[PDB]
Amino acid sequence: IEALPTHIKAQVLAEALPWLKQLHGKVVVVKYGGNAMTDDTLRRAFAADMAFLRNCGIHPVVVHGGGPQITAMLRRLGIEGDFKGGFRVTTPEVLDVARMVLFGQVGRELVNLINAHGPYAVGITGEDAQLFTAVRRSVTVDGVATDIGLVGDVDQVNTAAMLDLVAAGRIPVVSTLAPDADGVVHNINADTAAAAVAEALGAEKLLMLTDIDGLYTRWPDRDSLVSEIDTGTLAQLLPTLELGMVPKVEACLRAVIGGVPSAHIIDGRVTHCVLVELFTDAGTGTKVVRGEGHHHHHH
């Protein structure tokens, strides 16, 4: 805590060098969500960490999400959500509420928390300066022709305009909402979006906070927790996983394969989780790396 010998405090910082050296001047996309937003002590720690990275010469890019906040508003307002299946179905009136909450509330919280350390955080959506557009998406059953609503995926990204912000020393706080070729705003999956922007900016790393200690090869058995998994194998386990990890996983795959050296799935329930995963050799969380070939499977 504080009664720790100085000679040991230095032995901690000193060990981070190999990491500070690997991240310096590099972009790092962090997907904020889960207990990280909920718990006060956790988020306050998250904001402090972003400042840490910023004051080390690292370029953090935060991508956050909503859901509970969005549902809370839709209820508090009284919108009777329609369910064209097993999904919420994002209708126009709903999009307005989603965007309102995500950008005007959730993101605001984060920005102010970060800026408690300096003029760093700046909130933006795909709408602002058209940082990134979206393409309408839909779900299955089997005709797959089910229109879920104004939901979509990140289509294109203006990495140029984005890398300009990190250059000015700002920490962009992204709210997954982007217009399509026609101009209508669409709500995008925070996880997938984070992966998209990660690849586009040529990020050195992609972090994703979750209320889980890692990835499970077969959920029930917690002995199936992998601290590191190679791309080829993950792509083969995808069609046999939990739906809640599919976005997290696909995001990592799209990222690590799109060029992002590695993607991490850490436990956001831990205080200063980002500092631990970046400057400590703790085998906590799941690390994804590009790896194809029978040998990556055989070993």
| 165-184: contacts with its own copies (CB under 8 A) | 168, 170, 179, 183
15 interacts with its own copies by CB under 8 A: yes
| 290 annotated as ligand-binding | no
Q: Which of residues 259-278 bind Mg ion (CB under 5 A)?
A: none
Smallest separation, CB 142 to its own copies (Å): 34
| 285 annotated as ligand-binding | no
Question: Distance between CA atoms of 263 and 261, rounded to whole angstroms?
Answer: 7
Structure tokens at 26: 């590099």
Candidate list 115, 138, 217, 262; residue touching its own copies; CB under 8 A:
115
Q: Which of residues 242-261 bind its own copies (CB under 8 A)?
A: none
199 interacts with Mg ion by CB under 5 A: no
Query: How far does Cα 137 stand from its chain's mean position?
Result: 19
| 291 annotated as ligand-binding | no
**Which residue, 187, 253, 225, 209, is CA-closest to 39?**
209
Question: Distance between CA atoms of 142 and 156, rounded to whole angstroms?
Answer: 28
Are 106 and 63 a contacting pair, CB within 8 Å?
Answer: no
Are 47 and 110 a contacting pair, CB within 8 Å?
Answer: yes
Q: Which of residues 183-242 bind its own copies (CB under 8 A)?
A: 183, 185
Candidate list 29, 94, 102, 251; residue touching its own copies; CB under 8 A:
102
DSSP bridge partners of 28: 60, 205
Stretch that binds its own copies, among 13-21, 212-220, 223-231, 254-262 (CB under 8 A): 13-21
292 interacts with Mg ion by CB under 5 A: no
281 interacts with Mg ion by CB under 5 A: yes
Smallest separation, CB 281 to Mg ion (Å): 5
Candidate list 88, 103, 208, 249; residue touching its own copies; CB under 8 A:
103
Structure tokens at 130: 């058209």
Report how far apart the first and last C-alpha atoms of the chain are (Å, whole number): 40
104 interacts with its own copies by CB under 8 A: yes
127 interacts with its own copies by CB under 8 A: yes
158 interacts with its own copies by CB under 8 A: yes
230 interacts with Mg ion by CB under 5 A: yes
Are 152 and 180 a contacting pair, CB within 8 Å?
Answer: yes
Question: Distance between CA atoms of 187 and 208, rounded to whole angstroms?
Answer: 19
Smallest separation, CB 173 to Mg ion (Å): 25
Q: What are phi and psi of 280, to 5 degrees?
A: -135, 140
Burial label, 5 (beta-carbon count in 10 A; 0-12, 13-18, 19+): exposed
147 interacts with Mg ion by CB under 5 A: no
Q: Which residues are annotated as a binding site for substrate?
A: 66-67, 88, 187
